[PDB]
């Protein structure tokens, strides 16, 4: 599924990500424009040989598991599949671990590079909330 803009944010918020440790909704927004343009289907193919799935792109080394990446972890519990489905609930639930395990939103390299510092909140802004 490719989500609106606005659609996304309230999605997010409806799952209780907006302001989620202290990250307020437009800088999920801007990560998943970013990490997906908005389409649950995406995937990425690491050079470690993990692979990134979903709205927020969740990598197989550490949250997930696809079979397939070697000395990994599957820390929220989930085939990585579940990342892909138009229902973002196994994204956000996710999402929620990764940002609370230790460099907040850090974690989503592109978040840093293109989000962090910016007006977030123009992600949001004339969305009905
Ligand atoms: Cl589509
Ligand atoms: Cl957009
Ligand atoms: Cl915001
Ligand atoms: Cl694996
Ligand atoms: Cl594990
Ligand atoms: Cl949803
Ligand atoms: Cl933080």
Same mark, same amino acid.
Request: with cysteine.
């Given at each position: 599924?490719?989500?609106?803009?606005?659609?996304? =944010?309230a =999605?997010?918020?409806?799952? +209780?990500?907006?302001?989620?440790?202290?990250?307020?909704?437009?800088?999920?927004?801007?990560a998943?424009?970013?990490?997906?343009?908005?389409?649950?289907?995406?995937?990425?193919?690491?050079?470690?040989?993990?692979?990134?799935?979903?709205?927020?792109?969740?990598?197989?080394?550490?949250?997930?598991?696809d +079979?397939?990446?070697?000395?990994?972890?599957n820390? /929220?519990?989930?085939? /990585?599949? =579940?990342?892909?489905?138009?229902?973002?609930?196994?994204?956000?639930?996710?999402?929620?671990?990764?940002?609370?395990? +230790?460099? +907040?939103?850090? =974690?989503?390299?592109?978040?840093?590079?293109?989000?962090?510092?910016?007006?977030?909140?123009?992600?949001i802004?004339?969305?009905?909330?």
């Amino acid at each position: 599924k490719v989500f609106g803009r606005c659609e996304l =944010a309230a =999605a997010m918020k409806r799952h +209780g990500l907006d302001n989620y440790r202290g990250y307020s909704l437009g800088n999920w927004v801007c990560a998943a424009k970013f990490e997906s343009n908005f389409n649950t289907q995406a995937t990425n193919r690491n050079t470690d040989g993990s692979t990134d799935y979903g709205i927020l792109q969740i990598n197989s080394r550490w949250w997930c598991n696809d +079979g397939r990446t070697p000395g990994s972890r599957n820390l /929220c519990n989930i085939p /990585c599949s =579940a990342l892909l489905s138009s229902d973002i609930t196994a994204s956000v639930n996710c999402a929620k671990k990764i940002v609370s395990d +230790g460099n +907040g939103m850090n =974690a989503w390299v592109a978040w840093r590079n293109r989000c962090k510092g910016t007006d977030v909140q123009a992600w949001i802004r004339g969305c009905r909330l």
